[PDB]
Amino acid sequence: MPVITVNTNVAEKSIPVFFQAALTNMMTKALQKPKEVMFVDLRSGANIMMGGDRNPCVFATVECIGRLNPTSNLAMARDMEDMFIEHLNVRRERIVIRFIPVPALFCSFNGALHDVSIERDEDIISQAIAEYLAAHAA
Amino acid sequence: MPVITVNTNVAEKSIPVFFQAALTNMMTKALQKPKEVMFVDLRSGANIMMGGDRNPCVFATVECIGRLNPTSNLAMARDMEDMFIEHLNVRRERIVIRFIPVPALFCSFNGALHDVSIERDEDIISQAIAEYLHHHHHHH
Amino acid sequence: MPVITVNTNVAEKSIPVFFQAALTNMMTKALQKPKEVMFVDLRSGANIMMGGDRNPCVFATVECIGRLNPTSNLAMARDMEDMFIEHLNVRRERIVIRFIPVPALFCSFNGALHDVSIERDEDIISQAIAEYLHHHHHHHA
Ligand SMILES: [Cl-]
């Protein structure tokens, strides 16, 4: 995590070269995670059909520790959809995105697991309060 | 969801052309979902080995909101196995399937999330009761 | 399960031929499962970037019934990392591994589901206790 996987029958050659970089930047901001650990895995030219039909489609997954809830999921879904519509020429009704909560102690980075506090976004909340105190001095 | 992913070292050119369409129809019926949102993602010619050996194998996943339980999982597993044996020429002892429950509010389709009632199959249970009443002379 | 999935932008031609066999043997021992049902799915030459950058990286998953807990996950992560560094020439800070608990009744092998006692490692724990009692002279007549 965070890992954005895009499974699409749209041909690799036909996808803008900056698509993964743009999706990296967008989801870095949306998930409030360090850019350094944001993966984008583009499986383009996939043998994926939807509704028994080979028109352009996307099944995408977002794997993340914390950050995922009904409100953030819908907002991120619509922005991811918009990028797929614009850059892959895929219709909104051919896009399904799964949001996958990852437990902090069920995910390694760089020789260690993650802090459990991230699952409840306490990393953000505690930094948000500290920054508020710096700007208001209280 | 519903997304059926098939990971197999069986060569793409060896797979019947209608395999994905047939798996779509079968799992549409089995999962009682609209055909329109049924994905089949075939990863054929995959660099997948099983038991350290490159004999034909399948690792498949079924991602679905509701519908998955110990009873439906076993029945769907045996039918998916039968389709892999017949169409991919893979032995039953080289097939593993994972059934993945998806939360309604953790899955988008067409600009919206899904109804939480689907997670508990309330859509099926409520339609089953309504159809029972229609067929057995109960219209009020 | 157990399924080890390796997603790496490292080119297939650059990966030692025995990488999957070595990962199979290592994780068979680590997860205390039959070798027969250990899958290794290598997606090499993947179009996967990390931090907006195309330096060598690995996103791997371990799908397993039982066996996964904070203690086993860290130990397996470091050994998997060591094998990826050696075989894929990737830096530790370009490796993320997700450990995925699989329910026994949500996974088929060879026409049947899995017991359910396996989820809580009761197969290992009950065999460990029975072998301890064998070696320390306890009978069951
Ligand atoms: Cl998952």
Cross-strand partners of A101: A64
For residue B26, the chain A residue with the least C-alpha distance is A52
Q: Which domains does chain B have, with CATH numbers?
A: 3-136 (3.30.429.10)
Give the CA count within 13 Å in the CB-facing half-sphere of C15.
26
Contact call for B24 and A51, based on CB within 8 A? yes
Q: Please give the full DSSP string across B70-86, using - where no structure is assigned.
A: HHHHHHHHHHHHHHHHH
Q: How many angstroms is the resolution?
A: 2.2
- Give chain A as a 3 state SS string: CCEEEEEECCCHHHCCCCHHHHHHHHHHHHHCCCHHHCEEEEECCCCEEECCECCCCEEEEEEECCCCCHHHHHHHHHHHHHHHHHHHCCCHHHEEEEEEECCHHHEEECCECCCHHHHHCHHHHHHHHHHHHHHHCC
Instruction: Identify which of C47, C74, C81 has the shortest CB distance to residue A41.
Output: C47
Instruction: Identify which of B39, B106, B110 has the shortest CB distance to residue A48.
Output: B39
Shortest CA gap B86–chain A (Å): 20
CA proximity to C80, closest of C140, C20, C17, C14: C20
On chain C, the residues whose CB falls within 8 A of the CB of B101 are: 106
Contact call for C41 and B47, based on CB within 8 A? yes
For residue A9, the chain B residue with the least C-alpha distance is B41
Instruction: Identify which of A21, A39, A106 has the shortest CB distance to residue C57.
Output: A39
B11-B17-B23 Cα angle (round to 5): 95
Best residue in C8, C108, C119 to probe B by mutation, most B CBs within 10 Å?
C108
Cβ(B16)–Cβ(B88) below 8 Å:
no
For residue C81, the chain A residue with the least C-alpha distance is A111
C120-C124-C129 Cα angle (round to 5): 110
- Give the single-character DSSP code of C112: B
> What is the spatial distance between Cα B102 and Cα B82, in angstroms, rounded to a whole number?
25
Contact call for B52 and C20, based on CB within 8 A? yes
Experimentally, how was this structure solved? X-ray
The sign of the torsion formed by the CA atoms of C87, C97, A115, A66 equals positive
